[PDB]
Amino acid sequence: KNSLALSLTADQMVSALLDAEPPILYSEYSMMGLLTNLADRELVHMINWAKRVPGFVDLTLHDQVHLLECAWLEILMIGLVWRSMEHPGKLLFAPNLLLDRNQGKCVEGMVEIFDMLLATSSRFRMMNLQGEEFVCLKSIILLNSGDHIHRVLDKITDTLIHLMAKAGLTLQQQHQRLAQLLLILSHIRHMSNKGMEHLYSMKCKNVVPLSDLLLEMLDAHRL
Amino acid sequence: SLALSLTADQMVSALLDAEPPILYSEYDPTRPFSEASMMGLLTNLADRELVHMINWAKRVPGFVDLTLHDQVHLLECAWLEILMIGLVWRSMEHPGKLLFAPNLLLDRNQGKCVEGMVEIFDMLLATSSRFRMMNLQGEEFVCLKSIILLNSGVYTFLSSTLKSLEEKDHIHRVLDKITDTLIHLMAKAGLTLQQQHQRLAQLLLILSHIRHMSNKGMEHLYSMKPLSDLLLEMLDAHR
Amino acid sequence: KILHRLLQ
Amino acid sequence: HKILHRLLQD
Numbered sequence A: 001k002n003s004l005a006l007s008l009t010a011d012q013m014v015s016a017l018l019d020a021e022p023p024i025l026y027s028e029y030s031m032m033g034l035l036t037n038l039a040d041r042e043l044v045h046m047i048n049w050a051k052r053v054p055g056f057v058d059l060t061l062h063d064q065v066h067l068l069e070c071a072w073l074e075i076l077m078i079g080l081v082w083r084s085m086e087h088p089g090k091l092l093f094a095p096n097l098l099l100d101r102n103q104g105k106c107v108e109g110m111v112e113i114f115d116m117l118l119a120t121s122s123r124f125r126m127m128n129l130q131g132e133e134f135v136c137l138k139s140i141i142l143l144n145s146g147d148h149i150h151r152v153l154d155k156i157t158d159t160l161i162h163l164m165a166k167a168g169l170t171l172q173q174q175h176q177r178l179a180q181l182l183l184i185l186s187h188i189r190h191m192s193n194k195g196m197e198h199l200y201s202m203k204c205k206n207v208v209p210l211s212d213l214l215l216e217m218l219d220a221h222r223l
Numbered sequence B: 001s002l003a004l005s006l007t008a009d010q011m012v013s014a015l016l017d018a019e020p021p022i023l024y025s026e027y028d029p030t031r032p033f034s035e036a037s038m039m040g041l042l043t044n045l046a047d048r049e050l051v052h053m054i055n056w057a058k059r060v061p062g063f064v065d066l067t068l069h070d071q072v073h074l075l076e077c078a079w080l081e082i083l084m085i086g087l088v089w090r091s092m093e094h095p096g097k098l099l100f101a102p103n104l105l106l107d108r109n110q111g112k113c114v115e116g117m118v119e120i121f122d123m124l125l126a127t128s129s130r131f132r133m134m135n136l137q138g139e140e141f142v143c144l145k146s147i148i149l150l151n152s153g154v155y156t157f158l159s160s161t162l163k164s165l166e167e168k169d170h171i172h173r174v175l176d177k178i179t180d181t182l183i184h185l186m187a188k189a190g191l192t193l194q195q196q197h198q199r200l201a202q203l204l205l206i207l208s209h210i211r212h213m214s215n216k217g218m219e220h221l222y223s224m225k226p227l228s229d230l231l232l233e234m235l236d237a238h239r
Numbered sequence C: 001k002i003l004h005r006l007l008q
Numbered sequence D: 001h002k003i004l005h006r007l008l009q010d
């Protein structure tokens, strides 16, 4: 149908995805309280980011709501992992909230997820994942979380390959790298799934107040 | 280290030879459904498949190069995903149903009678239809299954040592080989270069859906407390 | 809905 | 040992 994503060349797609990037936020100036408030504010930016992903607003509103409902924790996580790459062994929740692995210990179930997030960060850094590849992956997470949607995913795949080719990677290296990145998405799905379980548990235990948006987002998966 | 020398065709041959059989159930279709009874059948079937899966794993190239701890970990991470991709594969030519065994089909009306199963049921169905529409081949299937085995547990832990980093990199090299092998199969099937990376992506994205279903499934498993000793152990790893 | 509204 | 361990050790 009417679709900007299917009208863009690979360079325009990259440009548009780069332009759509949300900002990096600061932590407010208990650990669970800080992290929650930070995720809440990121979610608002994430919703407006998605509206700028070529193809997303061409979907029906019901589709759009469903993709954000399914993908939101995946997208927060890959964002966190991206900005932590320059800080091996640490999670850069924000420029004023840099947490070592071991600061994940205070909260029940969190440090196991921290280890998985750090493994992901180390993998991306070892692969020398580029900004342009990252924004492609993030849009694939959004669209794959839930026929036109598949045409767009094909297009973002083409765009990923293109970036690798322009970077001088051989065909073999492109196929291998494409696979390496997409297999990491399986792991990001895993972490999101486990986190969603812990979030619901935290709501029940009533020890930190999840925000309205977070509560509403959380209610999506237990449905 | 020997497995890193295998050619594409040799990789396909090894994986096809190592394929587990499709197992049957003791299911008696001549009496009314019972939730407890069907769960027992599914548990028993799953338990028997796990034994086949463990011996299949030893035959996946590169797998036995890992220490016992890592072999154990990979199997613990991926067991339900591997059962599920098997189920969706053999369910392919059977729209509307999950073919647990040739003689045990679960239909959707009946799945509704299993408390909380219908959502996972529909996802499994969608995945199988996806594969059927893609005309997934046996050769591609066995590559995907091997990929799940090697990949699902490789990012659980941080590496604290160079040695640990190297064993991690050993797994990645084998995964790179199966990617090469997948592309090789697609090229030999007639697919243009664009088609090949598009098909490769589509298949790998489906692995994210399989992970998703496995996590949701695992949730329900450690909620009804059927389970065999081995299944309790595999489940314990996620709890 | 907070999402549905925000998307508009 | 774990059961999984034993099934491999065969």
Ligand SMILES: CN(c1ccccc1Cl)S(=O)(=O)[C@@H]1C[C@@H]2O[C@H]1C(c1ccc(O)cc1)=C2c1ccc(O)cc1
Residues within 6 Å of the ligand: A032, A035, A036, A037, A038, A039, A042, A076, A077, A079, A080, A093, A107, A108, A109, A110, A111, A113, A114, A191, A194, A195, A196, A198, A199, A202, A210, A214
């Ligand atoms: C939900 N999790 C969790 C897991 C176990 C125990 C407790 C919790 Cl909160 S968890 O997955 O780690 C989750 C990942 C990471 O840390 C937890 C978390 C988080 C998210 C929401 C929230 O209300 C609190 C915390 C993270 C996060 C925050 C902002 C980002 O931009 C990115 C990530």
Ligand SMILES: CN(c1ccccc1Cl)S(=O)(=O)[C@@H]1C[C@@H]2O[C@H]1C(c1ccc(O)cc1)=C2c1ccc(O)cc1
Residues within 6 Å of the ligand: B039, B042, B043, B044, B045, B046, B049, B083, B084, B086, B087, B100, B114, B115, B116, B117, B118, B120, B121, B213, B216, B217, B218, B220, B221, B226, B227, B231
């Ligand atoms: C655990 N699940 C579940 C979900 C909701 C309600 C009840 C149940 Cl059993 S579930 O994920 O559907 C799960 C998938 C499918 O059916 C359940 C299940 C299963 C697995 C182990 C078991 O002890 C019982 C059932 C399945 C299975 C078995 C063998 C296979 O080769 C493949 C799959």
